[PDB]
Amino acid sequence: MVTIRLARHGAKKRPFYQVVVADSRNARNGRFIERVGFFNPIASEKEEGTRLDLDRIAHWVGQGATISDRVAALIKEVNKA
Amino acid sequence: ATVNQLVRKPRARKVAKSNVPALEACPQKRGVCTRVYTTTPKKPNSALRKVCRVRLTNGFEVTSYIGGEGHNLQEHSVILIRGGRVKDLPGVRYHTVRGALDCSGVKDRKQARSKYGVKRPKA
Amino acid sequence: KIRTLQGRVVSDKMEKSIVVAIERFVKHPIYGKFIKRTTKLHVHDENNECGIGDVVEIRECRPLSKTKSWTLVRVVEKA
Amino acid sequence: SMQDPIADMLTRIRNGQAANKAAVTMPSSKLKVAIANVLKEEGFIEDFKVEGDTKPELELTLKYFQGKAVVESIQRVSRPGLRIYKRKDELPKVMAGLGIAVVSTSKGVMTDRAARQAGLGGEIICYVA
Amino acid sequence: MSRYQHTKGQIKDNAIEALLHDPLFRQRVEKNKKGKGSYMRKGKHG
Amino acid sequence: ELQEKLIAVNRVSKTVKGGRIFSFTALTVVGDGNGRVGFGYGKAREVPAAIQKAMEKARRNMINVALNNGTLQHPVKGVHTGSRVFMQPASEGTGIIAGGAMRAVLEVAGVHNVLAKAYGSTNPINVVRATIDGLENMNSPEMVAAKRGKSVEEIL
Amino acid sequence: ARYLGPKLKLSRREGTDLFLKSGVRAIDTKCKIEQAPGQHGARKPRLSDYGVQLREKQKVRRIYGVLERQFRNYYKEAARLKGNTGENLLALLEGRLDNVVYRMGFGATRAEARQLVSHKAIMVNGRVVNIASYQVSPNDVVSIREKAKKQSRVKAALELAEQREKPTWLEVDAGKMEGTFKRKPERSDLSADINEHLIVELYSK
RNA sequence: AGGCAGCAGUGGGGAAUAUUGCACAAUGGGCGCAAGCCUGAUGCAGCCAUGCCGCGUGUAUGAAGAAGGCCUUCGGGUUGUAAA
RNA sequence: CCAGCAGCCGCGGUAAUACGGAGGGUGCAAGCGUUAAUCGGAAUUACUGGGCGUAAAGCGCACGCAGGCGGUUUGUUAAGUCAG
RNA sequence: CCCUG
Ligand SMILES: [Mg+2]
Ligand SMILES: [Mg+2]
Ligand SMILES: [Mg+2]
Ligand SMILES: [Mg+2]
Ligand SMILES: [Mg+2]
Ligand SMILES: [Mg+2]
Ligand SMILES: [Mg+2]
Ligand SMILES: [Mg+2]
Ligand SMILES: [Mg+2]
Ligand SMILES: [Mg+2]
Ligand SMILES: [Mg+2]
Ligand SMILES: [Mg+2]
Ligand SMILES: [Mg+2]
Ligand SMILES: [Mg+2]
Ligand SMILES: [Mg+2]
């Protein structure tokens, strides 16, 4: 299924999460349909930590996509829960 | 060569064949000595050069020059050879690396030691 | 419109099927001279109205045979 | 036989200009007089004229500034065996902009700078520098 | 000490004369500094 | 004031009844560094004599050229006998990207920012002659515009 | 990672003073500058053009204490940036942190400045940097720590600085032992004996 | 009865390419309502200068121009502020 | 003219800055050389960018199919071409 | 007719 999830890039001990719609059958950082945002867990203050394209997230979840747990949490902070 | 001719027959590249065909695009190749001997060189240079007829692991039969100041290579010695043609010797295109499996280092050398497989003088 | 191509039919001696030479004009990649390129397609011709050497309009369709995936639209001029 | 009258023009200009002829004569055409119009307005030839009704002869009367040849270098590009077409941004700067490229584009023949201002491309007829 | 490869192969009369008529004991040409073979195109250090 | 520089000195040979006569030929280039450059070739029995040969010939043959703030006006080609040279003006701080003889002649001419390449035979004599040919048939936009009968604004 | 021999031998090789000593005495008194190093020092070398290029490049490297791979990556970055490549190269070279400390006068020589950087005597914009190859951005402000306020060598370095010539693109004070770097210098602010177009010739060979 | 061209590894070939490691802590997958289970994917650790990148081997002073070598027209110069 | 070095030119013959060592320098630097392999230099397969009287290179000569190119005017199409 | 490499 099309799935909004976090694919890891970056270096050792310093991850970077690309938030992406991808098929659930495929690899973690392999083939994907479409990037919808990013996430830096190691982003410091006075810069952006993450951005999410909530319009495309809503488009996909209404279109039939499922949501991963971490990205669901991140939607909660970008909507300021 | 007009452009219509080039379309009908494209430009032919040089094949540019290899100088050292025995190594088969490997940097070094292990062999066993089948005949160690000496040979006189071509004009103008004149000396007694030390070469060895070697059978490699891929079955080829080559002649390899031995550098340095005297060797210890005998019959059934397992040596390692590298590329590099010797000008004088007609037919010898390979060198025995010194400090090899059986090629002992050249005695009493304190310059070009890494080329001739020589340890540090303990000082 | 509908994507369709001009060609010159050169052999029709098999029945209910023609082969047409699409004559396209392609620049050479490394020399820059424009080279005449020919392409032969087997075309389903119902009723066999075409002749040798006609000019024919063809259109890609579903596979109708092993080598036939194109069908006639309208004969441009008869020879 | 004869297969490029435009190259015949450019050659006639080069040879007469090297031999220091005041004027050179050839047959005419619309493309020929168009090129002559470009060179008259842009400043390599000084004048040109067409004579005749069924046989139009184009005559090119030339110039020399300090005695030597005004046309320093001159060359046909879009040769019949090898046609040259360029995009908008690929119009060449002949002679680092000092010379011009007679280019035939969709709004007629014009110089390289006129083609660049118009925003068009076409056949690079000749480099004249 | 390595063996010399004589070019006479299998010697069955006299190997000393065989090595003479081998290229090992050949007569050798000396490049004159001046005289007949005198001209040097390029120096040793130039 | 006047910059002077040797490129290469060569030894040539006569053959006579007794033997050989060895003579030295040296070629130099002179230039004030403001686009006013020339070359001189001299033959002598001995090398400094060949040097003042090349000096006096270079000053008496030495000619003038047009420069644009340390670089050429336009790309230019020069051909003399078996040597072809191709030079382009360059941006700020590029340098004299050329061979040996071309390096010498342009850096004594006062060009600072040039790309260059030598095709064909690379004899220094033919190379410097081809380079001086390229400089002398190279032309500048102001004299081009006077030669035009139009303005520098019109041509540029 | 560094050269550990005689700096006066180096200055003898390039024939010119390279600011490689304290400067309390004359370099003529300290050593024989005008003679080449080694046994054949009295020879007058007929240097080839490649020799001139190599000696000028090595002169720049040995004045600025810069390793060769460092210098080659610096040239690559200088060609990457826009404008005069030699100017960008010397801009990067002057923007090296140890050279900034030397020009600011916190270190007597570039060796002392580089040692102080290694031993963490310099705060840069309130955060510690201990690498000499750190690039100081324009309009930055750097400090010296109290551990080197109590250290006596900085006073010697400072008095050597006011006997030496003042850089015009820096603002340094000794009362609070502090400095400010506002702009990248240019050629007239730099020395006139550096031959940068010849340097770019050598690396374009 | 069996199929390491899964991970680690062994033998052999070759000039040559590594540990019979820890953990689901994170990401992701399978199953399950979920807790949770499995995960040699993955996150990490160990070996190799294999490459790139970054730093270290210190800082000033010192003619005694020490020796001992190097050259010598034996006057001396050099190693050499180099050293102690 | 042995021992040897060599990527090329080549050095070694009793006065070797080319062999082996020392001293001194040069260049790199936790790397340094050698070998293997690709590109460049090589405009040395030349499209950009080569040549054929004598350096290698004009079929012994002609006719001619496919193929390549096309004097000039007007109108038309817009395939190539150009612009968005 | 020939002139050791
Ligand atoms: Mg089918
Ligand atoms: Mg050549
Ligand atoms: Mg490093
Ligand atoms: Mg395995
Ligand atoms: Mg093995
Ligand atoms: Mg399990
Ligand atoms: Mg001797
Ligand atoms: Mg090429
Ligand atoms: Mg050729
Ligand atoms: Mg012949
Ligand atoms: Mg011939
Ligand atoms: Mg003929
Ligand atoms: Mg026509
Ligand atoms: Mg169209
Ligand atoms: Mg005889």
From Swiss-Prot, chain B:
Gene3D superfamilies in the cross-refs: Nucleic acid-binding proteins
SUPFAM superfamilies: Nucleic acid-binding proteins
GO biological process: cytoplasmic translation; Group I intron splicing; maintenance of translational fidelity; positive regulation of RNA splicing; response to antibiotic; RNA folding; translation
UniProt similarity note: Belongs to the universal ribosomal protein uS12 family.
Residues with PTM 3-methylthioaspartic acid: 88
Organism: Escherichia coli (strain K12)
Keyword Transmembrane among record annotations: no
Protein name in UniProt: Small ribosomal subunit protein uS12
N6-acetyllysine sites (modified residues): 107
A GO cellular-component term linked to this record: cytosol
Other remarks in the entry: At least 19 substitutions or deletions in 11 codons can promote streptomycin resistance, dependence or pseudodependence; all but one of the streptomycin resistant mutations (K42R) are associated with hyperaccurate translation and thus reduced translational efficiency.
Described purpose of this protein according to its UniProt entry: With S4 and S5 plays an important role in translational accuracy. Interacts with and stabilizes bases of the 16S rRNA that are involved in tRNA selection in the A site and with the mRNA backbone. Located at the interface of the 30S and 50S subunits, it traverses the body of the 30S subunit contacting proteins on the other side and probably holding the rRNA structure together. The combined cluster of proteins S8, S12 and S17 appears to hold together the shoulder and platform of the 30S subunit.
GO molecular function terms noted in the UniProt entry: misfolded RNA binding; rRNA binding; structural constituent of ribosome; tRNA binding
Curated annotation (Swiss-Prot), chain D:
NCBIfam families in UniProt: PRK00136.1
Name listed for the protein in its UniProt record: Small ribosomal subunit protein uS8
Function, in words: One of the primary rRNA binding proteins, it binds directly to 16S rRNA central domain where it helps coordinate assembly of the platform of the 30S subunit.
PANTHER family to which the protein is assigned, alphabetical: 40S RIBOSOMAL PROTEIN S15A
The organism of origin for this protein: Escherichia coli (strain K12)
Record-level GO cellular component terms: cytoplasm; cytosol; cytosolic small ribosomal subunit
Cited SUPFAM superfamilies: Ribosomal protein S8
Homology family: Belongs to the universal ribosomal protein uS8 family.
Keyword field contains rRNA-binding: yes
HAMAP family: Ribosomal_uS8_B (MF_01302_B)
Quaternary organization: Part of the 30S ribosomal subunit. Contacts proteins S5 and S12.
Disulfide bonds: none
Entry keyword set: Repressor, Ribonucleoprotein, Ribosomal protein, RNA-binding, rRNA-binding, Translation regulation
GO terms assigned for molecular function: rRNA binding; structural constituent of ribosome
Protein biosynthesis in keyword set: no
Biological processes annotated in GO: cytoplasmic translation; regulation of mRNA stability; regulation of translation; ribosomal small subunit assembly
UniProtKB/Swiss-Prot annotation, chain F:
GO molecular function, one term: rRNA binding
Phenotypic consequence of residue 103 to G: In strain: NEA-314; neamycin resistant
UniProt signal peptide: none
One protein family per Pfam: Ribosomal_S5
Record keyword ATP-binding present: no
Oligomeric form and interacting partners: Part of the 30S ribosomal subunit. Contacts proteins uS4 and uS8. With proteins uS4 and uS5 encircles the mRNA as it enters the ribosome, which may play a role in mRNA helicase processivity. Can be cross-linked to mRNA. In collided ribosomes contacts ribosome rescue factor SmrB.
Domain free text: The N-terminal domain interacts with the head of the 30S subunit; the C-terminal domain interacts with the body and contacts protein uS4. The interaction surface between uS4 and uS5 is involved in control of translational fidelity.
Name this polypeptide is given: Small ribosomal subunit protein uS5
UniProtKB/Swiss-Prot annotation, chain G:
InterPro entries the record matches: Ribosomal_uS4, Ribosomal_uS4_bac-type, Ribosomal_uS4_CS, Ribosomal_uS4_N, S4_RNA-bd, S4_RNA-bd_sf
CDD domains named among the record's database cross-references: S4 (cd00165)
Record carries keyword Electron transport: no
Top-level taxon: Bacteria
Domain S4 RNA-binding: 95-155
Protein keywords: Antibiotic resistance, Repressor, Ribonucleoprotein, Ribosomal protein, Ribosome biogenesis, RNA-binding, rRNA-binding, Transcription, Transcription antitermination, Transcription regulation, Transcription termination, Translation regulation
Keyword Transcription regulation part of the UniProt annotation: yes
SMART domains xref list: Ribosomal_S4, S4
Example GO molecular function: mRNA 5'-UTR binding
GO cellular component: cytoplasm; cytosol; cytosolic small ribosomal subunit; small ribosomal subunit
Residues in the signal sequence: none
GO biological process, one term: response to antibiotic
Chain's role: One of two assembly initiator proteins for the 30S subunit, it binds directly to 16S rRNA where it nucleates assembly of the body of the 30S subunit. With S5 and S12 plays an important role in translational accuracy; many suppressors of streptomycin-dependent mutants of protein S12 are found in this protein, some but not all of which decrease translational accuracy (ram, ribosomal ambiguity mutations).
Family: Belongs to the universal ribosomal protein uS4 family.
The name this protein goes by in its record: Small ribosomal subunit protein uS4
Encoding gene, per UniProt annotation: rpsD
